[PDB]
Design a protein around this nucleic acid. Structure first.
Ligand code: MG
Ligand code: MG
Ligand code: MG
Ligand code: MG
Ligand code: MG
Ligand code: MG
Ligand code: MG
Ligand code: MG
Ligand code: MG
Ligand code: MG
Ligand code: MG
Ligand code: MG
Ligand code: MG
Ligand code: MG
Ligand code: MG
Ligand code: MG
Ligand code: MG
Lengths: 176, 109, 97, 189, 46, 111
RNA sequence: GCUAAACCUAGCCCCAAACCCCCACCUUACUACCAAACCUUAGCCAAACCAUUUACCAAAAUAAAGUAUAGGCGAUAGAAAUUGACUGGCGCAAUAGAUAUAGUACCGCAAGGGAAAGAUGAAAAAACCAAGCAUAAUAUAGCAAGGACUA
RNA sequence: GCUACCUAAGAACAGCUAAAAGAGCACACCCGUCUAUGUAGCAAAAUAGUGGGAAGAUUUAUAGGUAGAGGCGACAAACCUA
RNA sequence: CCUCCGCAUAAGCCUGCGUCAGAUACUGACAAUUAACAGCCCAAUAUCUACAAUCAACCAACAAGUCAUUAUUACCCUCACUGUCAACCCAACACAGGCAUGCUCAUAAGGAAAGGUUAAAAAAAGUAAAAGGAACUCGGCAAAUCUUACCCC
RNA sequence: UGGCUCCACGAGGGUUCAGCUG
């Protein structure tokens, strides 16, 4: 299949290759699931072809023929990913009612920030994982003062930004 | 003494360099000779369809029509899936015995 | 060399501005509005100096006790350092002991 | 593009732009964002003042992010272009940009500088119409495929019958992969 | 003798002495990290 | 696939299948005169020898006889106009030795 | 005539208002997967030494009142009862205003310290003067000038 | 991460004389007696010759521990990142 | 014509004299270190281990020493991941300094003291010196040739 | 508070002879 790592031998060095119109999420929604599997592998082989051509263009320092179609193929891949994940999300909402496909909690680390802690699929239960029990999901009364200081740092950046936008508008109204 | 450079597997003593590793997933387990046992089930299998005799191909025409965006909401999928409930007048209660479980995902991609 | 070599863009002033043209209105609101307001209530400013004058130590003391519990933490720390310094200064320095 | 960067008519990915704003300068801006903007790329306008005061032309490109339009063949100056060596070589014109609220649109029957307001006709939905008169203004503006472009019917087969199956399960049954074994339960914490 | 070179590098000593795990072990080291975070430091530890 | 949480295997669970692989490799010209029947590939960091062999067996129907890999360090030595360091990335290189003497040779694109 | 010199907006300051925020990562952080928080601040400093004491900091307008009161009764400290509580700028303008072009570069084992700087314009798809020199080295004698002188 | 001391698991010590001794001469290494150069130096303590120990109370790599009126010290107010 | 040099591992660095192109080991682009070496280990319950090493053989000690598994239970699925470059590290420097271990005992490896003159003084280092031989000097310090004895601690 | 002897050792501090030498 190395002959399909490279494109058609007639096209080698023609300074422009006429191929356009990347896929669209609507067309991919109209297609099936097995069809989307097959189209993913079509696009994957052609994308490996395009990356090979781009790397060899860098190696020989000659201009890449069709960067726009590598952009199109990455767009096609991302649209197909979006479509399949929409079907997965919708079916997950119907059968389980869960918004996210991986479990988590809203924890509070040592520094007292509130984080989303994504869970991590172990073999022994939580209460006897030694490493997990070394990790800490609570803060302490010195984290208190540091939290106040970080909050006020953000408040200062926000006050700076709003004041500057108003000053910009005022000098603009002087100009016009 | 660069703090600012990333910490990698190329960047320590011989034990550090042997332990760190890039993000490749494990494929087996190590035992008792420092001998490595690869588990076939832990090795991922590429499921690749047969693409011979196929018409979908990696671009479309510019003569294709324009159509507006409609993301697949759970309500739309619901109605399209159980119009037979209207005809009368599938659902999973739990997911222990299911292979491709939805919420605590069992599958890849 | 320190002197500017090209003279500046002209500052042009609207003396008949709205703020200029109506400066001073509703001062005398008490004396000729039978005394239910005060020009110190016409003053727009911070809460701790609005109808008050005071000097730099007294301004810091009044700012601490009027708006100090809403201040950012190191702004309080600078204000307490400043009251401490100005106390030492106004009570222990200068001539006229 | 970075912030604090000036829009030239040269596109950001060009040598002229790369050498006009190299990544180690700092510069003041020019003041110019009221999205309701009526000139579009491909319209016929009428320059009022300046060089060729009172003439009619065609809009080629719009610098819509800096309140500029450049009109085709008009409002031009000149530059020695190319010429590759220390002699006179070649002279080519270039077109300087023009300012909005100083150039106006042309009605195709009145041929006068007009001001246009976006009113909402019953045709649908918000199309340029003048304020002194009517005569609605339109909007300005063969490929046969190769070996890797689908036909329109191939792109629009619509082979998705909806069902309560994951792509994983459907492809399993489609290719006939059987998986007898059952996934042992892990703790997720 | 010639006394320029007190820094005799080893990444084990560097990581064990000034590392993130050690900083986070002590409650005073947690405040060291919190101080670097507030200062805005791009690197909070070794 | 890369940047995806893999499902844990306990003892007798199903095999890990992947549908819609996230791995995009590229075939590179060798820099130092590798033999016949050695293809060179540039590969994401998360992809093993076994992953690349099964990738090429399944997707491309290349018979692979041996795969070797190495991690290339990219230079962190370049500096900006800010004297802050520019990191060329780190990549993975594989050397694929073909089966049955199939003898690939890198074509002359850009003639 | 070289080196330069010049510039104005990048932003900042003080107020008002309004309560704000896919993967990996505590193991050698940024690494898919194994058997415990809670305890008076001290001291510099004033007392011209210092030893009891020494303002506030640990939410509280104006006045009562710096009063009652405390106190090596001295430096100083000090109440209460009671009593009327819509955004702007005689701010900075690049050694200033923020440390900030950035907590970066650089320094330090670490905690930590911590910068500098840009100005063509509508479009670049276009002129003069700091110091230091040079044009142009010097001619008895001396704080380098002053009175002068035809010089 | 220097340096003082300790802990854990390592290593080095030619030849001749001698015949398990804190042995002799002497390399490797460790130290720093005398001189000379050097002094904004090659070096914020070096160089060159001269010298002392060199199977031991030795030197030494790696990891760890003791922390500020504290540690540590075969006491020199020595050392604890010039 | 030179060299306790050189090669390798360890530790430390982190692409830092590879190719090409450009400007005045610098800049940019493109390449590259491929596991067999090395690292990342061990399913346990109970239990077994008085005997040194030193050519270990007599023989010699004292300071008394490192190398070790069994009965049974469960376990055949097999070879992934990571290190691998260089003229390099710690000394602000392309620093006469610091730097562990194996091997080569002058190298089969590695290197160059002199930019070009001239041939003043002073200065540094070396070699030679009639006669004399410490008269020098605080003192035989330095050099030169090697040695004796007495005290003090 | 010993005292008198007392052997070996010292980049310790002095002294003598001999040689050797700028
Ligand atoms: Mg006092
Ligand atoms: Mg500043
Ligand atoms: Mg500053
Ligand atoms: Mg001058
Ligand atoms: Mg001995
Ligand atoms: Mg002496
Ligand atoms: Mg000692
Ligand atoms: Mg003493
Ligand atoms: Mg003494
Ligand atoms: Mg130095
Ligand atoms: Mg040689
Ligand atoms: Mg010379
Ligand atoms: Mg003589
Ligand atoms: Mg004499
Ligand atoms: Mg004499
Ligand atoms: Mg001598
Ligand atoms: Mg001795």
């Amino acid at each position: 299949g190395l002959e399909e790592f490279f494109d058609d031998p007639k096209n080698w060095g023609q300074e422009k290759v006429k191929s356009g119109a990347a896929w669209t999420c609507q067309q991919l929604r109209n297609k099936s699931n097995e069809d989307l599997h097959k189209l993913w592998y079509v696009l994957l082989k052609e994308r490996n072809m395009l990356l090979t051509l781009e790397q060899e263009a860098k190696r020989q320092r000659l201009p890449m023929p069709s960067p726009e179609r590598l952009d199109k193929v990455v767009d096609s891949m991302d649209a197909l990913d979006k479509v399949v994940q929409e079907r997965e999300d919708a079916l997950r909402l119907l059968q389980t009612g869960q918004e996210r496909a991986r479990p988590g909690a809203w924890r509070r680390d040592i520094f007292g920030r509130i984080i989303w802690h994504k869970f991590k699929q172990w073999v022994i239960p939580w209460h006897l994982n030694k490493r997990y029990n070394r990790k800490r999901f609570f803060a302490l009364p010195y984290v208190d003062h540091f939290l106040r200081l970080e909050r006020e740092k953000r408040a200062r950046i926000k006050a700076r930004k709003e004041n500057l936008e108003r000053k910009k508008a005022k000098i603009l109204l002087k100009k016009f | 003494a660069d703090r600012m450079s990333k910490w990698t597997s190329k960047r320590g003593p011989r034990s550090f360099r042997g332990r760190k590793g890039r993000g490749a997933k494990g494929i087996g387990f190590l035992t008792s000779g420092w001998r490595f046992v690869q588990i076939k089930e832990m090795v991922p299998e590429f499921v690749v369809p047969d693409l011979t005799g196929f018409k979908l191909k990696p671009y479309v025409s510019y003569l294709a029509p324009e159509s507006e965006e409609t993301p697949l909401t759970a309500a739309q999928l619901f109605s399209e899936a159980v119009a037979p409930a209207i005809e009368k007048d599938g659902f999973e209660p739990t997911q222990e015995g299911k292979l491709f479980q939805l919420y605590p995902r069992n599958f890849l991609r | 060399i320190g002197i500017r070599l090209t003279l500046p863009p002209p500052k042009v002033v609207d003396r008949w501005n709205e703020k200029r043209a109506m400066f001073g209105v509703y001062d005398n609101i008490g004396i000729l509005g039978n005394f239910e307001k005060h020009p110190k209530e016409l003053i727009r400013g911070p809460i701790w100096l609005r109808g008050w004058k005071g000097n730099e130590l007294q301004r810091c003391i009044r700012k601490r006790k009027m708006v100090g519990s809403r201040m950012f933490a190191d702004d309080l720390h600078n204000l307490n350092k400043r009251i401490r310094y100005l106390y030492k200064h106004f009570n222990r320095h200068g001539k006229f002991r | 593009l970075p912030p604090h960067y000036r829009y030239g008519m040269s596109p950001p990915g060009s040598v002229a732009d790369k050498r006009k704003n190299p990544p180690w300068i700092r510069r003041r801006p020019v003041v110019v964002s009221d999205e309701d903007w009526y000139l579009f790329c491909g319209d016929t306008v009428e320059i009022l003042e300046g060089k060729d005061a009172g003439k009619q032309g065609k809009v080629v490109q719009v610098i819509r992010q800096r309140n500029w339009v450049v009109v085709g063949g008009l409002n031009t100056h000149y530059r020695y272009i190319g010429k590759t060596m220390d002699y006179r070589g070649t002279m080519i014109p270039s077109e300087a940009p023009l300012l909005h609220r100083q150039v106006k649109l042309v009605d195709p029957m009145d041929r006068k500088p007009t001001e246009i307001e976006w009113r909402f006709t019953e045709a649908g939905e918000r199309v340029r119409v003048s304020t002194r008169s009517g005569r609605i203004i339109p909007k300005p503006e063969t490929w046969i495929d190769g070996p890797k472009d689908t036909s329109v019917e191939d792109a629009l087969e619509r082979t998705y019958v909806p069902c309560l199956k994951t792509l994983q399960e459907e492809v399993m049954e489609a290719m006939g992969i059987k998986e007898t074994r059952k996934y042992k339960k892990v703790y997720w914490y | 003798k010639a006394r320029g070179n007190e820094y005799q590098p080893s990444n084990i000593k560097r990581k064990n002495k000034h590392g993130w795990v050690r900083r986070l072990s002590t409650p005073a080291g947690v405040q060291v990290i919190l101080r670097r975070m507030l200062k805005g430091r791009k690197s909070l530890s070794h | 696939a890369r940047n995806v949480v893999y499902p844990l295997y306990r003892l007798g669970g199903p095999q890990l299948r992947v549908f819609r692989t996230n791995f995009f490799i590229q075939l590179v010209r060798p820099g130092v005169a590798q033999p016949e029947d050695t293809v060179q590939f540039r590969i994401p960091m998360e992809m093993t020898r076994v992953d690349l062999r099964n990738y090429l067996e399944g997707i491309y129907n290349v018979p692979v006889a041996a795969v070797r890999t190495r991690v290339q360090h990219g230079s962190n030595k370049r500096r900006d106009h800010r004297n802050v360091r520019i990191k060329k990335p780190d990549y993975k290189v594989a050397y694929v030795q073909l089966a049955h003497g199939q003898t690939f040779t890198f074509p002359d694109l850009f003639p």
